[PDB]
Amino acid sequence: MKVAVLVGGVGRRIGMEKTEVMLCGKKLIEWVLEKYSPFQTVFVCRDEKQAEKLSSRYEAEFIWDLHKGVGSIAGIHAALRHFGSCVVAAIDMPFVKPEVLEHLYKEGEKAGCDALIPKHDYPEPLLAYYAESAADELERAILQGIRKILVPLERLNVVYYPVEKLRKFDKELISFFNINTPDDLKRAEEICSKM
């Protein structure tokens, strides 16, 4: 299984790069490093500059969008151009369960679709399966200056997977918990504490 971890997120509402955020005494980048090291993983940075700073800190595969694309779409595209189909996971979700990812990848591959994205009332694109066949539409969006993943997804054959079908792998669906604002760090802390 191939995993592309999006770590180029710049913590705006938290006043510090996401990678540096301290979760239970450990940086977020070290959280995902540990969690995904067992797989065929690449960490997608916002630019080569970040890749250089992280790679001099950790022995892992750090890549970036060749044509300096910005945002999530550019990060996913970069991963697809690097090694093909994979499951994407943002660093913003430090509690993702590998079982959940494994399922998404397998189901995504067999389904024969451009992307398999978890969904309740709204989809969660940064925690889904993307096949290589989805790269062109994503790249067109990047070149057209479109930073709304929903736009290129409409031009692709997407399979929206009921988030409920994932509870068998994740009881509380904690895999979907995102850290973006002050109230999240407070909760994130309580969660990693009870663990």
Would you list which residues are annotated within the binding site for Ca(2+)?
Answer: 184
Q: Which residue has the tokens 């450990």?
A: 26
Least distance to Ca ion from the beta carbon of 10, Å? 16
Least distance to Ca ion from the beta carbon of 181, Å? 6
Among 60, 70, 184, 185, binds Ca ion (CB under 5 A): 184
Count of positions on this chain that bind Ca ion (CB under 5 A) = 2
Q: Residue ranges for the binding site?
A: 184
> Which residues in the chain precede a discontinuity of more than 2.5 Å between C and N?
none
Closer to Ca ion by Cβ: residue 166 or 188: 188
Closer to Ca ion by Cβ: residue 48 or 184: 184
> Which amino acid, 49?
K
Least distance to Ca ion from the beta carbon of 134, Å? 11
Give Cα 171 distance to the centre of its chain.
20
Residues 6+ apart with CB under 8 A from 23: 31, 94, 179, 188, 189, 192
User: What are the strands of the beta sheet with 2-6, ordered from one edge?
Assistant: 62-63, 40-44, 2-6, 86-90, 127-130, 115-119, 158-162
Subset of 125-144 contacting Ca ion (CB under 5 A): 136
Roughly how many angstroms between the first and final C-alpha of the chain, as a whole number?
A: 26
| Gyration radius of the chain's alpha carbons | 16
Closer to Ca ion by Cβ: residue 45 or 134: 134
Least distance to Ca ion from the beta carbon of 80, Å? 10
Least distance to Ca ion from the beta carbon of 123, Å? 16
**Site membership for Ca ion, residue 170 (CB under 5 A):** no
Round to whole Å and give the CA distance between 111 and 47. 32
Residue 141: other Cβ atoms inside 10 A: 23
Name the site residues for Ca ion (rule: CB under 5 A). Answer: 136, 184
